[PDB]
A = this chain, B = another copy of it.
Amino acid sequence: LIPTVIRAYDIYSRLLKDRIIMLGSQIDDNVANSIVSQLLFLQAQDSEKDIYLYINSPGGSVTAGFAIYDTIQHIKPDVQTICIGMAASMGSFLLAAGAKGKRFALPNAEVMIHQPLGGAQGQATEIEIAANHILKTREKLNRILSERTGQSIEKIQKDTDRDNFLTAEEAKEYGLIDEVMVPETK
């Protein structure tokens, strides 16, 4: 049950009013379509002011993740990315896809990078097509990470061969984020 805040907003709709979008679950097409539409709407409201993408996600669909990636790059406003809780797989990809100098993580947040997961069954030719497709998809993802992080493509491939868990501070020095957002007031 999502609480209401007083016009009357559900808490997530209230956050959208101050240009905060919530990527808070597994990335499927429904989540992507919603985050795309929110990005488009916020552009139309104001092309100058920053948008804030909250990321607490284990990842999910690559294609759905790319719907969000492209929409972030297409629109005029800077899209800040803030990892809170965890950003894994396509979650961590989108965290690195934020506007330069405005990608953050909170101190105890967990960033994880790995290679894409998929499947194929049937004839040897069908297996070959699926294998060729997912290998092209991985290289596409590794290319963009290399550009976004400033690590070489070969380093990205080695480090994503298996699940690679990084602390907030480790994700900064890797180049996935720009800053560990510390508690100033405390």
Contact = CB atoms under 8 A, between A and B. Distances in A.
A109 B126 CA distance: 22
Contact of A70 (B7, B108, B127, B137): B108
Interface string A4-46: 1111111111111110101011000110111011101100100
A41 B122 contact: no
Interface residues of A, number: 92
B125 A41 contact: no
5 contacts: A1-B10, A70-B85, A70-B107, A118-B122, A127-B134
Contact of A63 (B76, B85, B121, B124): B85
Interface in A99-130: 100, 106-110, 114-130
Interface stretch (A148-156, A158-166, A171-179): A158-166
B67 A41 contact: no
A74 B4 contact: no
Given A129-B163, A165-B133, A108 B66 contact: yes
Interface in A53-69: 54, 56-57, 63-64, 66-67, 69
Contacts of A18: 44
